[PDB]
Symmetry: D2
Subunit: 136 residues, 4 copies
């Protein structure tokens, strides 16, 4: 199994980040290798907010999606992928799932290839839509 790892930090001061790029890569690599997988490549956004999707490596990852280079996207923590629920639903549902690519967020133990991971997504989407309708 070929797996893409996505890592992000808001700043370029690795010493001061809660989890530096290198700590993220190390955990994700160690994990993928315990699972018996291979990391096909590393997408790294060092010094970019998770508030929006307009980040070079994330854009690269989305573009490379239509190459079948990998079949899983791995993040250390969901907030590394995005800090927007709407952006996360878009990425995981309309970009990853739509192209038969699974998504794993280690810290949250969310894996969209599992029964409970896919149900989590369905629930997040349904509840998010319901909340938005209540507040709007």
């Amino acid at each position: 199994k070929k797996v893409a790892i996505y890592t992000r930090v808001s700043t370029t001061n690795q010493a001061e980040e809660g989890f530096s790029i290198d700590e993220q890569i190390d955990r994700l690599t160690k994990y993928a290798e315990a699972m018996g997988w291979q990391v096909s490549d590393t997408y790294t956004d060092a010094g970019f907010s998770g508030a929006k999707l307009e980040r070079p490596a994330m854009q690269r990852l989305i573009n490379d999606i239509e190459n079948k280079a990998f079949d899983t996207v791995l993040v250390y923590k969901l907030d590394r992928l995005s800090r927007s629920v709407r952006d996360t639903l878009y990425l995981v549902k309309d970009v990853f799932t739509k192209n038969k690519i699974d998504f794993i967020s280690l810290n949250e133990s969310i894996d969209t290839s599992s029964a409970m991971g896919s149900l989590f997504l369905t629930i997040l989407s349904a509840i998010n839509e319901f909340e938005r309708e209540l507040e709007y």
Copy 2:
């Protein structure tokens, strides 16, 4: 069931219509309405509203065991306030909550689960986005 009817419009459906739909519903179910609580001309953005406050203060009295609204957004336009009201005020005091339009009844297994899921997901969303 002994039900309290809560209705609101800001400054959807009119007060009269909400009262009408909910009285008809209660009677068709065989329920008794204990009182009506009407906030005519108030925002749902916050909980500071005279009839809502009268309702919350009347909990101690035990004149009703269910709060009934036509649509959830009459109760509140805030997910956080809705959860506080339904979870920490009504449920905490053994008062069931029914929203006719959303077909949500916290005395049912699925209404109760819905409330649990909404709370767990809202907290998950906060933690992602904060």
Copy 3:
């Protein structure tokens, strides 16, 4: 709105049933009329188990589904419709929902036209499949 009511009892001794056919019809009619609807017809299986779908009125209801005579099916209690989760998932998902017919079970306050009613169904289906895989 035109609505079909489905009622069932296992035996023909109405005096001894927990909820007789007439009590079921009365509640459902009173409910539909409070809601401002009209009962287009009544499907009644008096003296049939809920363990299987092979019952005259239920079969009639399924057959009449492709007529657009009604757009909602109403039951007093889910167990009147079926006492099988698999049969219930089939009816509500593959017969009702598939033909754009909503389903309401009064006692359970389940309405498949609502956000939380449709999510309940999705969850029941996902969890039922998961349980079956665990036990088999």
Copy 4:
């Protein structure tokens, strides 16, 4: 985390393979394995199994704070027993539960919700079918 590894085969994957996958996983996560609990040649239909019992009895000792299995059905082939174990034995004693294959971790928000939903739905199903 200090983890207890539970593996089982009846009379999927071998004992050796389960132990291997789970030790590698624990080490990659930085966790310590406190002990292995192996039921080689036992049905998952019931909870009466020597290593399972040793595990449950070892809870009082506090040598681990997580139970780790490769696949949920190693733990049990019964939804009712699984719920008893995970909800009323592990969670009740502040012990987390991880099933690697199902990616279920009761210390996560979504693993915890999953357990809540499975319990609520199983009860709903029983009540329909009984």
